[PDB]
Amino acid sequence: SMSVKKPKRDDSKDLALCSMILTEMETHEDAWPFLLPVNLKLVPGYKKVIKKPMDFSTIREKLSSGQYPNLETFALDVRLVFDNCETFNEDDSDIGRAGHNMRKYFEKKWTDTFK
């Protein structure tokens, strides 16, 4: 509360560390469904159904331009990419399996780097 604070965690490396995670997600062989925004002119139903589209290139631009106020807002966007994927794609599909694989990959890096 006022004048009562927990000891100050060193957050000075968070930006660099989120960048490194994102590089590792970008270079994963199963990243291909997530690298660029879904083309809303060419994929029927996507625009109406997915209220907040997110992809790796859009996260990279937000990260590089100071649009994440903290490491939690960063994780929320990465998770959004996989939540969108599950919303639109059957589990038994190449893209559906890609999303589950990438979510696991992310969550382990996230825990190992920050928890």
Give the CATH number, domain containing residue 8: 1.20.920.10
How many distinct structural domains can be found in the chain? 1
Residue 108 belongs to what H/E stretch?
Answer: helix 94-114
Quote the domain boundaries for residue 27: 1-115
Asked if residue 46 lies in contact with residue 53, where contact means CB atoms within 8 angstroms, the answer is yes
Asked if residue 105 lies in contact with residue 98, where contact means CB atoms within 8 angstroms, the answer is no
6 phi/psi in degrees, rounded to 5: -55, 150
Asked if residue 28 lies in contact with residue 105, where contact means CB atoms within 8 angstroms, the answer is yes
Question: For residue 93, what are its two tokens?
Answer: 């599909």
Largest CA distance in the chain: 54
Rounded Cα–Cα distance for residues 43 and 23 (Å)? 27
Name 61's Cβ contacts closer than 8 Å, sequence gap at least 6.
67
Angle between helices 71-88 and 14-26 (to 10 degrees): 20
Resolution, given in Å to one decimal, reads: 1.7
Name 14's Cβ contacts closer than 8 Å, sequence gap at least 6.
70, 71
DSSP for 39-106, written as a single string: -TTTSTTHHHH-SS---HHHHHHHHHTT--SSHHHHHHHHHHHHHHHHHHS-SSSHHHHHHHHHHHHH
Cα angle vertex 42, ends 67, 77, to 5°?
Answer: 25
